């Protein structure tokens, strides 16, 4: 269910993407933290132009240095846990590129040229 297919390959696992004072302070910290995490993820999908989607594609190409593997092995012979570890050192690079692409698209949409 919740983490169902966690040990399955990434391709297979795509099927589950659709799935008193001190006490007071701990409860407030837990609630505030949950909100902050929610908003950070929504903000990030928003800034990349993936708002409301589980599957989102972009205009950023995958770099040849980001594991240098083929799709026929990546999706079929690896799990998401393994994949996340395999490319973890490119996390910020990819996120930055996604933000740049989306911002450029938005700028193109309001150009004085075309648009009208």
């Amino acid at each position: 269910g919740f983490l169902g297919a966690a040990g399955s390959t990434m391709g297979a696992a795509s099927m589950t993407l659709t799935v008193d004072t001190h006490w007071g302070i701990k409860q407030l910290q837990a609630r505030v933290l949950a909100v902050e995490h929610y908003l950070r993820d929504q903000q990030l999908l928003g800034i990349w132009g993936c708002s409301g989607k589980l599957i989102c594609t972009t205009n950023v190409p995958w770099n040849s240095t980001w594991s240098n593997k083929t799709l026929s092995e990546i999706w079929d012979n690896m799990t998401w846990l393994q994949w996340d570890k395999e490319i973890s050192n490119y996390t910020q690079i990819i996120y930055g590129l996604l933000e740049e692409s989306q911002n450029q698209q938005e700028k193109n949409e309001t150009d004085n040229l075309t648009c009208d």
Binding site: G7, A13, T16, C50, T57, I94, L98
Partner: protein, 433 residues
């Protein structure tokens, strides 16, 4: 060009994490842990998932320790602080029956300040020697063991401390992974991992030496050491059969209420009516002997030599040398030397009773346990032994601090954070209209 970045959300990936867990659910327990748990909790098996567990480094244990202390202190805070009792006491011979002297008791008289500030009154109560210190020497002047350090808070007379199971629950965004390997034994990779949101429910039992009313091992007895080879670690032997223990205090303590202030009173023993023995506990002999034999059978797998010796605990404070536990609100300190004495119908262990308690050490604080009227009997399950190790190996019923009692139950759980975002290459570039 091919190989485009694709963003996915809802990805089944987690990382190790430390967070605040919910305690969830006249008794102190659940006085604040008042949130009903899921009546139908689910467990999800993760196929082909192997995780590394380490009970000795489990943050859940550390967090429980803090919750236990915090609840305890909050519970005791709103009631009388026993400060007017730092007085010189007479503590004379407590006598009974045919001119018998009670070995553990003294009749202490003192001048109490009363609620009206111009009065002083002579009051007296019957006290245990364990709570009293000799002043000077060759003298009738005595003092309580406190004052030397700090004041004692009287336990709030209307609060029960009887343990109930508590299920710790992860906050949304977090999950608890559970290890279901029958022979997992403390640390390392665990296959057959399942996901739960809340733990199975652990009673916050605070005994030492012999663990009481815990979960029972399902398979073979598990030794569960941090390092079996190095004799500097606690060994938590988890038994797969419970040993029955019964404890009795065969007497009625009467009570005298001494007013000590403007709305405050101190409770103390008046007279003791009943037997002379302060307390005792007993364990069936065949059960104990066989149980200990089963434990050595497994110890021999780590120590493959036919000479295992059990000896009584080392010297020190009663809190570490005896079997300390809470029995009906009473505090028992039982002598287990009769159990841990062997080389490889029942046994009765004498028990001491003490009223000024320093639970979890803490040092700067103490609690006074009011006398309890009526006689007390407790029946409980011995579910695991705490051993320390000293070819011809010797083991003793020693132990660590209270965290070890919870390590023995929380060993199968780990907290992780869920990270639903991730990326991977695809064949499709974003379609832009």
């Amino acid at each position: 060009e091919n190989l485009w970045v694709t963003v996915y959300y809802g990805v089944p990936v987690w990382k190790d994490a430390e967070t605040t867990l919910f305690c969830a659910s006249h008794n102190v327990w659940a006085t604040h842990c008042c949130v009903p748990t899921d009546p139908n909790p689910q467990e999800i098996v993760l196929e082909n998932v192997t995780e590394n567990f380490n009970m000795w480094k489990n943050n859940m244990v550390e967090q429980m320790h803090e919750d236990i202390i915090s609840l305890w202190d909050q519970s005791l805070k709103p009631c009388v602080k026993l400060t007017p009792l730092c007085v010189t006491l007479n503590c004379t011979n407590a006598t009974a029956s045919n001119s018998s002297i009670i070995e553990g008791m003294k009749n202490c008289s003192f001048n109490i300040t009363t609620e009206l500030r111009d009065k002083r009154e002579k009051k007296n109560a019957l006290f245990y020697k364990l709570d009293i210190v000799q002043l000077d020497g060759n003298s009738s002047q005595y003092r309580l063991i406190n004052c030397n350090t700090s004041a004692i808070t009287q336990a709030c007379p209307k609060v029960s401390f009887e343990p109930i199971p508590i299920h710790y629950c992860a906050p949304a965004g977090f999950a608890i992974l559970k290890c279901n390997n029958k022979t997992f034994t403390g640390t390392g990779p665990c296959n057959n991992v399942s996901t739960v949101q809340c733990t199975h429910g652990i009673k916050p039992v605070v005994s030492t030496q012999l663990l009481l009313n815990g979960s029972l091992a399902e398979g073979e007895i598990i030794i569960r050491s941090e390092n079996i080879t190095d004799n500097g670690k606690t060994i938590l032997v988890h038994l797969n059969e419970s040993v029955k223990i019964e404890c009795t205090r065969p007497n009625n303590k009467t009570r005298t209420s001494i007013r000590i202030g403007p709305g405050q009173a101190f409770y103390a023993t008046g007279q003791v009516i009943g037997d002379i023995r302060e307390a005792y506990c007993n364990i069936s002999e065949s059960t104990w002997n066989e149980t200990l034999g089963k434990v050595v059978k497994q110890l021999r797998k780590h120590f493959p030599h036919k000479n295992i010796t059990f000896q009584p605990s080392s010297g020190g404070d009663l809190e570490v040398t005896t079997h300390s536990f809470n029995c009906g609100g009473e505090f028992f300190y039982c002598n287990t030397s009769g159990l841990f004495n062997s080389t490889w119908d029942s046994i009765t262990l004498p028990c001491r009773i003490k009223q000024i308690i320093n639970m979890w050490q803490e040092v700067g604080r103490a609690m006074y346990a009011p006398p309890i009227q009526g006689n007390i009997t407790c029946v409980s399950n011995i579910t695991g032994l705490i051993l320390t190790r000293d070819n011809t190996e010797t083991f003793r019923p020693g132990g660590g601090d209270m965290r070890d009692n919870w390590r023995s139950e929380l060993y199968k759980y780990k907290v992780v954070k869920i990270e639903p975002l991730g990326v991977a290459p695809t064949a499709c570039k974003r379609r832009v209209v």
